[PDB]
Design a protein around this ligand. Structure first.
Ligand SMILES: [Mg+2]
Ligand SMILES: [Mg+2]
Ligand SMILES: [Mg+2]
Ligand SMILES: [Mg+2]
Lengths: 591, 297, 591
């Protein structure tokens, strides 16, 4: 509340850190009776459930996989006697979609939104040198006032079912690491950085926010050598001969933030930062003053068995694959990802477009009576995403919506405060975008004028004019691009989705839609369109890997537009992209 | 019990291939089928000759498919009817002496709610009666949008043939029990309009790829297909007037390109290379267990 | 050393516990220069590596996947000031295959064997309220004196390659959770339990081993109710109306072991135990005095991406699948598994045959000059496995070797002390077995007479007499079984391997080897043989899931005898087993 902080939890001189991941207890609550019946004190019946994971794909029955409603997680944690006098705080990386947290039966936090972190202060609720009960009442129902948007339906037997307005499966559960922290009562809550390159090195302007009056120092280490230091909650770190963070050539420095009372250290926060500038100038993405042509993926937090659960082996493999294929960029479609993925991007020198879960916004959608409530949740998600992610060198842009009905009346009243908030929140003033639906054209989109660069999701040759008529698709595509050329007025345009479903091993000569041949033919046509226009400055293909969707006749066990399989092996299209992306120079498409 | 078929195989399109024909009959004997429909066109004579020798029942179908203002109000309808009459005449003249041929299907999924349906159907069903010395029963297959109370064509049929996809095209997915209740709802309507006539199913099924397994099921998996078939057959088995099940389709076959078609149609009980999918074992156990005179009336 | 303890690490009244899993640093050391060059103080170059995982399948290049030799893991851990006076101990669930551990550059532990835990005491090496460097020098080379056995070879360019004598891939790395512990200097090191059923309940005879003189109490809780208590390092817990642990009907009690100095608690250990008896009598496996026909799997610690890394979501899914299919039993082929898998078996009521990595033992193998060294490592592994696992209610038997060349001269001299050790180590005197190679026949096996029950790995109809001649395989199989009937003398026999490689979706009518049809035909024939003989008391099929092997023309991307795919979905054979295993009564095969 007053001590809100989205800093990644750290063990430091002054902070203790204990992970609570593991096997928890779990119970569905179909009659929504748990609070009144006393389930926060003990679950009457339960089953074992690993945390972090989505719960859905662990079961063998469909009613549990598709369960929609209230469900409970429960575990126990020990608070050492020697933590007395510290603040005792629980961190949830995320709980999907909303959560009420109880410790020893007393409610200590509430959170809305399934993809961003929140804390629960339990200093005066825990018993010291004893075990404590942690109960989480979570809910995964969908509505038109949340991110992501959808509805729920009732089946014949009375079970609730989720009905998303979005393509991906409604995975819920506790997807990210949970932490038990001991923190000084006076502590760092936040910090910000801005970067500037100079003739002899670089400068970092910083702020630090603490919840108290005691002085702050900030130091920057390159290994064991201190390269900069500064007193005060605001200041500048001067880094002579700064080693800059670059695409596929990351360099990170160690940041030490301390609060002092006299000669004692009252709090210490530790992080790693990269020295880099990023901005649009002259219709180009400039990284450290040099243009970068973006190439990479829309992704998902999705894998076999675990749903959206964080899995560091999968994360490592995914980066090894993105390095192998020559990607330099990905978008966090369609929700902020676990912090650990950005940390790895920070180390591997990957560029991230950070996206809030504003997907499914499709009378027009923005005329609904419920729009003010939706906007409130959208602003909160945006605020939390930018506060959590603003110091990652990898994060270079914000995507504020995915495929909204931006031809709807009321679009401008909705977009204007959102894009203003994104400008205000970001000390680095990184470019803002949103991805454009196929039904929003250059001349009808009410939202495109707000974007600092335009992001298109286009499927000319799949959803539109697919099949034997690939050349009709190409001409329709060129037709629309001529429109975008007229409305862009210098702005870069990138593609954030395109591709075709194709199964590993489906070969046909000549091609049919769903075959490897068709995908390769579609990609070659699509890239020829891209390459025709000087303003196209990035291609992010849909999707890095096959991922799970709701059931439907259009979805052959989920979405099959992966460049890799869900098991993280290449499909034939991975070799097309590898040759292209490693052949295109980093500054492809002079403007 | 049996199949809607196609004259379709790898490489040759609809070309006649006696080895494929022999294999297909060996498969239909193995699975316990006794019947198939020549969807959606008369087949090569050699297939009827083999049915004659293997003791299979054939519903013989003219290529009156794609008839979907209403379709039967078009100015071009008189010309269409002329070609339809000629095809019907030639089909019945060619096939009338096959012992295997026991029924005529005059249209596949026409828009039989269209105005002008009766003016179109009446002379066709009369011609089929006149042409056949054996006066074998006449049918046509009913589109999913033609309901017991709205179909203008069903009253002409000697037995009703339904193409139904409750749980695939309509109410598919986690909601399989909603599909079952909607299906029972429509069947209660058919019970009211049939007036003693047999009803058979001439299409039903789900696309599923060989080897796609998932627990619990998703549409396109072997599990889903088996779950859908068990639900569907429980509906069939509930009604004394359901006197036949011909599933779609004997084998995976080629369609035009589209996002809905994973290299053609994948509702085959066998692959296009003529090997069983998991559903072939469900049908084999069922069809060889049901007595020949199942469903006393 | 003197404080050796294989107890699972626990947070208690007196013990602190901090997990160290996460992203570590990692470096190959192909020239084996790291110790002399100072890598324990810092790795000169490194890459990020998730722990726990095998390292091999994260990379995109084969030289790294197949790397054989020395490799380094490195991380940092913080020791709080307020841990001063506690013992500071690192626990490694496992390091594969051997490890040298350094803290702040000083060597603090050495361990041989890749599948069992070890500790490193670092009390006097760490800096307090500071960060500390943890470096692990690991090695994955194979030899004929280790478990599992193999050799290494040198390729043309000089790279070492592993050449296993075993089928499974030589996954190495840090496969299991790593822990930082604060423990009282006087503490529980071990405890043992034996169970006895009475007319009014049950009795548990216990021992407790501490490294000091202060008194011990032991308590047993059912929820918040204490149901038994006892003073002394030996004693009996009397549990009136004991709720017994049963197959698919587990019941666990909470065990509290405390050391006291006066009225202060100096140490507390916490565990969960199940009250059950298990023994062979009258040629039957008796669980709580009732016979159980064993059905289930040989398994592997194997999954996509992570190699043998522990993954609790995969573990949960695997148990959900084993419950769905009707299994009641599995063998930990071919090495002890992560403790967490036994803990889940304890909760789901599954029976485990616990197996030491004595695989690849195939002049005869037991005439080699190196046999005394091999036996030494085998005894150590056996000792550690039984000490680690003896208190799991799920663990009901010990498998001492997998497919040794037990026709070799010297077999008896090797087997006799091993089976004697297994008897001595186990307070519960659970039955001992080993799995019999296909070339070891009833009349030629020198080892079978040592087994309390015989375990056969048989492939009649796959490796031997496969194809159109399935009926020749059946008669050869009956022929050998008539031999086993003559040598068993009342002992149960179980099958611990059988099956055929078959790809998901490979259908052929009529069957060919590798098709679903063939697998079903082979299983039906095989089970008809099983069902013919009253002494066959268990079937554990090979294998639960497709798993990775070394490359070869016989291995279509690993081993394809899985009843489930590697992604944990059923193949057609899963439905055959589900119908059979849920139809057979629990006490099938009266004797
Ligand atoms: Mg999506
Ligand atoms: Mg400082
Ligand atoms: Mg093996
Ligand atoms: Mg006690």
């Amino acid at each position: 509340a007053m001590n809100r902080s989205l800093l990644y939890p750290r063990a430091t001189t002054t902070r203790r850190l204990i992970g609570l991941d593991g096997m928890w207890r779990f119970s569905f609550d179909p009659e929504s009776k748990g609070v009144e019946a006393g389930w926060a004190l003990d679950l009457p019946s339960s089953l074992s459930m690993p945390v972090p994971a989505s719960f859905c794909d662990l079961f063998t029955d469909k009613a549990s996989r598709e369960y929609c409603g209230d469900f409970w997680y429960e575990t126990s944690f020990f608070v050492p006697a020697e933590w007395s006098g510290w603040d005792i705080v629980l961190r949830f990386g995320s709980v999907t979609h909303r959560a009420r947290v109880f410790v020893n039966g007393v409610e200590v936090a509430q959170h809305e939104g399934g993809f961003l972190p929140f804390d629960a202060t339990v200093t005066n609720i825990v018993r010291y040198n004893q075990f404590n009960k942690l109960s989480v009442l979570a809910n995964n129902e969908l509505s038109e006032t949340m991110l992501p948007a959808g509805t729920t339906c009732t089946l014949a037997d009375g079970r609730k079912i989720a009905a998303p307005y979005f393509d991906f499966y409604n995975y819920a559960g506790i997807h990210r690491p949970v932490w038990l922290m001991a923190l000084p009562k006076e502590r760092v809550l936040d910090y910000s950085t801005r970067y500037r390159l100079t003739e002899t090195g670089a400068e970092i302007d910083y702020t630090v926010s603490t919840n108290g009056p005691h002085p702050v120092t900030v130091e920057l280490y390159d290994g064991t050598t201190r390269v900069a230091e500064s007193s005060g909650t605001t200041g500048t770190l001067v880094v002579k001969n700064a080693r800059l963070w670059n695409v596929h050539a990351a360099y990170l420095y160690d940041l030490v933030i301390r609060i002092h009372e006299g000669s004692a250290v009252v709090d210490e926060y530790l992080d790693r930062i990269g020295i880099r500038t990023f901005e649009i100038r002259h219709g180009r993405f400039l990284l450290n003053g040099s243009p970068v042509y973006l190439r990479g993926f829309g992704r998902h937090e999705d894998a076999d068995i675990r749903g959206r659960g964080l899995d560091l082996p999968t994360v490592k493999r995914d980066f090894e694959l993105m390095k192998w294929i020559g990607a330099n960029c990905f978008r966090t479609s369609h929700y902020p990802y676990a912090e650990e993925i950005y940390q790895m991007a920070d180390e591997e020198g990957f560029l991230i477009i950070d996206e809030v879960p504003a997907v499914g916004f499709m009378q027009g959608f923005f005329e609904k009576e419920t729009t003010p409530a939706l906007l409130k949740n959208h602003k909160a998600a945006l605020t939390d995403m930018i506060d959590r992610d603003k110091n990652h060198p990898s994060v270079i842009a914000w995507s504020l919506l995915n495929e909204p009905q931006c031809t709807s009346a009321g679009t401008e009243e909705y977009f204007k405060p959102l894009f203003e908030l994104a400008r205000r929140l970001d000390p680095q003033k990184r470019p803002r975008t949103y991805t454009v639906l196929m039904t929003s054209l250059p001349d009808t989109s009410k939202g495109q004028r707000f974007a600092d660069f335009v992001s298109l999701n286009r499927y000319y040759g799949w959803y539109v004019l697919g099949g034997a008529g690939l050349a009709d698709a190409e001409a329709a595509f060129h037709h629309e691009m001529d429109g975008w050329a007229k409305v862009l007025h210098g702005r870069p345009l990138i593609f954030t989705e395109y591709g075709t479903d194709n199964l590993s091993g489906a070969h046909k000569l000549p091609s049919v839609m769903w075959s490897a041949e068709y995908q390769n033919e579609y990609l070659e046509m699509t890239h020829a369109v891209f390459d025709h226009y000087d303003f196209v400055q990035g291609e992010l293909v849909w999707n890095f890997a096959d991922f799970q969707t709701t059931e439907g006749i259009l979805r052959v066990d989920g979405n099959k537009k992966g460049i890799f399989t869900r098991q993280r092996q290449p499909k034939d299209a991975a070799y097309l992209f590898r040759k292209r992306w490693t052949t295109l120079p980093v500054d492809f498409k002079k403007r």
